[PDB]
Design an enzyme around this catalytic site. Structure first.
Site, short mmCIF file in Angstrom:
data_model
loop_
_atom_site.label_atom_id
_atom_site.label_comp_id
_atom_site.label_asym_id
_atom_site.label_seq_id
_atom_site.Cartn_x
_atom_site.Cartn_y
_atom_site.Cartn_z
N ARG A 108 0.23 15.71 -16.59
CA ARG A 108 1.09 14.70 -17.22
C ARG A 108 0.69 13.50 -17.93
NH1 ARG A 108 4.21 10.25 -14.46
NH2 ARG A 108 5.99 9.94 -15.72
N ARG A 162 11.03 -3.98 -19.75
CA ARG A 162 9.80 -4.63 -19.25
C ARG A 162 9.88 -6.05 -19.33
NH1 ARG A 162 6.58 -1.02 -16.04
NH2 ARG A 162 7.10 1.08 -16.81
N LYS A 207 14.72 14.25 -18.53
CA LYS A 207 14.56 13.27 -17.16
C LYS A 207 15.84 12.67 -17.01
CE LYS A 207 10.73 11.07 -16.58
NZ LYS A 207 9.96 9.93 -16.87
N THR A 267 8.51 12.14 -7.98
CA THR A 267 8.44 10.58 -7.76
C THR A 267 8.44 10.31 -6.42
OG1 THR A 267 9.32 10.22 -9.98
CG2 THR A 267 8.81 8.28 -8.33
O1 OXL Z 1 10.45 8.68 -14.79
C1 OXL Z 1 10.51 9.08 -13.72
O2 OXL Z 1 9.61 10.10 -13.36
C2 OXL Z 1 11.07 8.28 -12.64
O3 OXL Z 1 11.93 7.48 -12.87
O4 OXL Z 1 10.80 8.77 -11.43
MG MG Z 2 11.87 6.81 -14.95
#
Ligand code: OXL
Ligand code: MG
Ligand code: YII
Ligand code: YII
Ligand code: OXL
Ligand code: OXL
Ligand code: MG
Ligand code: MG
Ligand code: NA
Ligand code: NA
Ligand code: NA
EC number: 2.7.1.40
Lengths: 519, 519, 519
Positions: free
Chosen positions: B61, B108, B258, B316
């Protein structure tokens, strides 16, 4: 989803499945449950037997409790003439099996006053002496009854009940002599000649296979019968005795053990292991054990046979009133449907086809009811349970069979076509109870006849010459099944069917499952 | 029954299944769940990438939240050098996919005092002004914080919470100006440069696909990436925008949406329909919604993806402590196992492989845990439920796939070998969650890389010339899979495997299932 | 149906249950899973302990691996001062239990250079001698490590692995002497003083109950503790030894066996039979057995405890990162939720509350997660399975308990109120895992404290004088529970609750279940 009770089929509980059963949901054309018909004076002519096959008869049962070998050889000849009258069209030809049902250890009374039609009136409360003196074997009357079981006094006591003629006449032993009994009539009625006698609770010591049964089994081998229905099987050694009598020449004849007494029910597991199949012989069973318990024995035996993957037949008085009437009672319609819902591979007719006034109507009614009931089976739970109570094995043929049944449910296939030599690959599929009919293509005529013992198998006898390349011969047999299914209304061009074949010629090589459209 | 939790597999209740889980029951060699590794300074050299592949990495990734196109092109070059260093042995070659993860609509902060290592201490109770004045974009300190979201004042109010750096620093808006905010530090700590900011409950109006995301997606097409992980997808039109950017040239690149905000969870069904797969992006998700609710969103999404047959990734902080330690915490071991038991097709590592001190150990740990958890799945109920929630269709490929999975359970097969061009026939099998590994043989390199998105698919890239007779070419590819399974310890000579093939060349013709012994 | 995941609760498959989990469905106010907090320097002041109780602490755990009897007596005094500071309002008073956790057969290293803060760097590949010479018990360094297990050379061999400090430092025995070992550092790091040592695969022969453990158990009886968490229980005789030490004076103290080695898992059934409950002590367990197998041991033990109706605690590193951070990782949130979904009666915090920077936040997070997870349990299948794996008995108290749980599901009751003297009648209800909170009214303070070991029991200590007529005293206690439920937000006037009472005073007479509206 409107046809074949498919709305009820999708319910996720048995209660909702029942709530969704729809009288307006048409079943498929195929009728999966085999119909066994007893042949007799009402059904033994070639002309009638042709109509019986057209009405749905799959197996002709010869009852060796009556008639001579000459009489039975003529019945078998007529069954074969009628069956082969349809052979010129292999696409529509329906194989018909011949079953020999043994007399076994029966007890029978003598002749009333020397005549076959003469009858005497037994009144409740009256005395009736049972004699074993052969001087009275043709002189039975309201005072004295002769019977052929010479050891009867050794197995009954004072208070013992004796049933005569389908358990309709009941007697109670009041006095016991060395070679005679004095009884009191409890349930009276009219007594005829040569009636069946039952001694519930008595340890009757007649042999399982008598000298007459030996002659009859040997006659069956000579006549090339497909199966034997062995009467009053009580233990595994009784089945082994029948197997020994059939011997090497009769090694391929199927042995169906008839369970009709308490011992047969108690030792069922060992009988099932030794037999090719079972018959729930309810007539005698319902006299030997309390009539209110027969449904328990029937459901237990059908359950254990389905669990073992062995054929089970439900028999006797299924449509009894149709011996004299053109329509059955509501209890009879319910009985046939519930035998199919229970899991019976075959259902049977006895007097309804042997001597009744409406044999064709009785066969047609079993066909109609069985087809309606087949659509009403809750396959969702049945298949789930059969899969769980099935061992994990390295047998590739069993994995292919269960894969084919799973695939048939997924695409609601018009059929599962199976190429088979011995019948085993088709039996393996039938054991999982698919909704789809199983078209078993074989070149072995005996395999085609014996296939009727299993629910859902439609045996078809391929008469084409063998093609030299194995792949082309497999294709020819699969095309023959496609033609059978289209001709019989099971499916049509474009429908999806499941096809099971092997990787090389011979038995035991079924390993390929294909999902193909009908050409 | 002692291996692969087969004693627990036979339990007829979920509670008894749990009671039977055995730490001494060894799993099979095959590990079914794909492992996705984020590449960074700890893992971007060719030497390390070779060890990463050997340790279990299936997908690399690239996180486009950081780094230039030149940096990412060099990472992709190194991934390909490492992957192709094993190509000389096709039997053992493991395809490795490349995934592009978009920056998306992130917020950010600026640089602290002009340096990348400088940090300031934010104390609880202290005041902190948020400015949008570019004069302070490199002059952030304990009194003033610049951030790049120019419309922030329009979407927050007094009382709004602002989270910074993985939600570790918390601020509450006390005063709102036209283009600045005055906040109070609730949860303090050390503030670094360019940290991520989350505004839970605010309707952030940044575009789903920014000008930077467009350049990055177009770069992905030029670099021949296998899939895109699109950040912060909130609705189906966001997925359609990514699909439009990839266009015709990128039509075969998989889009994984996502889900990392409340809107993404609320509009999940429409996002799933439009996407090729889903990532449960727990980092941002657990800041956007209460951390105690993330497991609900994870289980809901994995459930709906399994029901739809689309790949789902769990991501994550799965093994977060391994960024600094050689062994994970007990919560981390549990998290990886439960993600696999939930039904995740893939699991992911972020900082653990990108910048941590133990990247190889982290990959090895996900491999070890996933394999143990795969054996602990209650396939008895899972398969039953997947079958029931599957529509009856006339698709012969789906009937063949479910037939193959049923057959694999019946014979506890060493593998299901599937010949596939586009990957579809192998995806159809994986959707039924067999216990057996799926060896997908393909000659298409992209199909081999993309197969890692589905649980249980072991893609193998056949490099042999095509045989002129179709049957011989099918046999060659099946033999190649037999060699792969034997070499990788999945099965041995004499074991039984399931083989799925088609009746003619091309896509969409899979219709044949064979149960064959391994040569 | 929008609240408490009631839409997911109605799904008829586990997969659909997962698909229906809703992050916007609010849980009920009641949190059923007990929270056990380890007390230490971060949490032993009276002021902090009051906040800990308000945050959700139900049990205070004293770790006897550290500290003197004077230190632990002061902690117990502070716990009692904080707990009784709320006693003036019985309606809101939350009983708090005291648990003594034994040191057990631990292996510890000596002091580095004579100081408690001094540390040495162990580099991978370096040699490290393990000595048993007491001259070096305070002179540990990078070259020589003293440890207190005098028989270590008899149980390890060349090749044996030795783990130090939560298994973070790994050594391999290269040379073995009569009373020393020469090892090679495999996983290096910083070595501190008095660290825990684990010898996986070695048959460590330390006693289950040492002379120190005897003094500590006897001290527990003197201090009136509610339960003992016995470390490293390997067999039933170890539990019997603890039971003998507690003796007659400590006969009512509950013994929770900690399972933290392979032998404890192998002999689990006999340990469970002899114990009052179990702790899945994951820290040591995950070093003694491969870390990837801990989830199997956890699920097996929680399953067997739920099946037996005995309390089970999930412990160690559940929210580990919160020792230094104000929010947990995503793996930690998942771990706590999955421990509750597995069936853990209690969850525990160790360093998070004993020495961490955010003890209150850690307690609050376990409370929040446990409550969300409790709503996500699939009670439909869990209750069905608990009922089936429950024996038919003539015990009227068990029939009343299961009747009450069934009735609570039918009317979605706000609570099941149970009057109990010993706690047994409330434990009987909790064993069936109702969704409704169980308000256990007792006048016995120890029963109220010990009730926290069972999922769903909210013990309330009735301080009212006994009414002379039994019926009026029963009514007073039921009214006290109605007041507690209303005050704590469990239910309101007009809601329906289940009430369980007995026919006469004393233990073992619970036989009456009433469905009544809240006044
Ligand atoms: O973007 C991602 O993978 C997160 O926020 O976990
Ligand atoms: Mg994220
Ligand atoms: C008759 N019968 C079945 C038949 C089948 S297949 C053999 O048709 C599959 C499951 C079942 C089942 C399951 N439960 N029950 C009990 C039950 C449940 C709900 C309603 C009723 N009337 C009975 C049966 O009688 C029952
Ligand atoms: C987690 N889980 C399952 C997992 C699977 S496969 C996805 O591993 C299949 C059924 C199930 C199920 C069915 N019922 N319950 C509820 C339940 C029943 C008995 C014991 C427990 N602890 C939970 C589950 O939690 C549950
Ligand atoms: O023999 C039989 O078939 C019977 O008794 O029913
Ligand atoms: O003792 C404990 O609790 C452990 O080892 O986790
Ligand atoms: Mg009979
Ligand atoms: Mg421990
Ligand atoms: Na299916
Ligand atoms: Na199967
Ligand atoms: Na109920």
């Amino acid at each position: 989803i409107q046809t074949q009770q498919l709305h009820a089929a999708m319910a996720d509980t048995f209660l909702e499945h029942m709530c969704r059963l729809d009288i307006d949901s048409p079943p498929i054309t195929a009728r999966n449950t085999g119909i066994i018909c007893t042949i007799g004076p009402a059904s033994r002519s070639v002309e009638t037997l042709k109509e019986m096959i057209k009405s749905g008869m799959n197996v002709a049962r010869l009852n060796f409790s009556h008639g001579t070998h000459e009489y039975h050889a003529e019945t078998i000849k007529n069954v074969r003439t009628a069956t082969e009258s349809f052979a010129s069209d292999p696409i529509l030809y329906r194989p018909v099996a011949v079953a020999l049902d043994t007399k076994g250890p029966e007890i029978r009374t003598g002749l009333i006053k020397g005549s076959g039609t003469a009858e005497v009136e037994l009144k409740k409360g009256a005395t009736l002496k049972i004699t074993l003196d052969n001087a009275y074997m043709e002189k039975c009357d309201e005072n004295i009854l002769w019977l052929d079981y010479k050891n009867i006094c050794k197995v009954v006591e004072v208070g013992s009940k004796i049933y005569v003629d389908d358990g309709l006449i009941s007697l109670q032993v009041k006095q016991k002599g060395a070679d005679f009994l004095v009884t009191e009539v409890e349930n009276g009625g009219s007594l005829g000649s040569k009636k069946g006698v039952n001694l519930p609770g008595a340890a009757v010591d007649l042999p399982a296979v008598s000298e007459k049964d030996i002659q009859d089994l040997k006659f069956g081998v000579e006549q090339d019968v497909d199966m034997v229905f062995a009467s009053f099987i009580r233990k595994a050694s009784d089945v082994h005795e029948v197997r020994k009598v059939l011997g090497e020449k009769g090694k391929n004849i199927k042995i169906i053990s008839k369970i009709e007494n308490h011992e047969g029910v108690r030792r069922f597991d060992e009988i099932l292991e030794a037999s090719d199949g079972i018959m729930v012989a309810r007539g005698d069973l319902g006299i030997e054990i309390p009539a209110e318990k027969v449904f328990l024995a029937q459901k237990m035996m059908i359950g254990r046979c389905n669990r073992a993957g062995k054929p089970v037949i439900c028999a006797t008085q299924m449509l009894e009133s149709m011996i004299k009437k053109p329509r059955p009672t509501r209890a009879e319609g319910s009985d046939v449907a519930n035998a199919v819902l229970d899991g019976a591979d075959c259902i049977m007719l006895s007097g309804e086809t042997a001597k009744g006034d409406y044999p064709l109507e009785a066969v047609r009614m079993q066909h109609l009811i069985a087809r309606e009931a087949e659509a009403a089976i809750y396959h969702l739970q049945l298949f789930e349970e059969l899969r769980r109570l099935a061992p994990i094995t390295s047998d590739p043929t069993e994995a292919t069979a269960v894969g084919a049944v799973e695939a048939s449910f997924k695409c609601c296939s018009g059929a599962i076509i199976v190429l088979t030599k011995s019948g085993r690959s088709a039996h393996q599929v039938a054991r999982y109870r698919p909704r789809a009919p199983i078209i078993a293509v074989t070149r072995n005529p005996q395999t085609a006849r014996q296939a009727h013992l299993y629910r859902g198998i439609f045996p078809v006898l391929c008469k084409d010459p063998v093609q030299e390349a194995w792949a082309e011969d497999v294709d020819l047999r699969v095309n023959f099944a496609m033609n059978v299914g289209k001709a019989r209304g099971f499916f049509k061009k474009g429908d999806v069917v499941i096809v099971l074949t092997g990787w090389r010629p011979g038995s035991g090589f079924t390993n390929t499952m294909r999902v193909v459209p009908v050409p």
